[PDB]
Amino acid sequence: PEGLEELLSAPPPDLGAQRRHGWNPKDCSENIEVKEGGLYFERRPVAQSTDGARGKRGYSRGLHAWEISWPLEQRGTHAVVGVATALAPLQTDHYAALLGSNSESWGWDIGRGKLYHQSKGPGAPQYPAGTQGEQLEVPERLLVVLDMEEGTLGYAIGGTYLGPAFRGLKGRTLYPAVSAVWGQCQVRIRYLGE
């Protein structure tokens, strides 16, 4: 949080920078429409399909943080927030935790609290660890913190860092990513630096 506090204390990137760091119309599922030049996306109502988007920008160095706004009524069965390399698939023909189900993506299921990386599903670790059966709830907004100096991926909720969910990310070029299953869900991304 010292480097994070310095990042969040700084004036926030403007509309231009938020758009350049927002969702990519040319790197999202065929079932997703990117709106307002990257500030948000809308997933169209397609059955038995999990669909994702990637940010326009890949980070391999420094500290990067972005706010995801995802309404609770628009999450459905599998709402995953995380990162991916440029080769991670952005679509699958069933309802799943797509982001984190392969070697190229890392995600937190914000509905179940499970972490996914090269994961099928059963036995996925809980995040924060030790909270299984506590029926925790991730609010509408959440902060995603990627530290490429340390090679970690973490999350912050209400200005509180939960600690690193994933480690060993150095040498990779990682993009903000999500995977959604909800018909007409709108996910906002608000990049905050560095």
Partner: peptide, 7 residues
């Protein structure tokens, strides 16, 4: 109108 708001 499935579980994930898709009919």
């Amino acid at each position: 109108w499935d579980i994930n708001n898709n009919x």
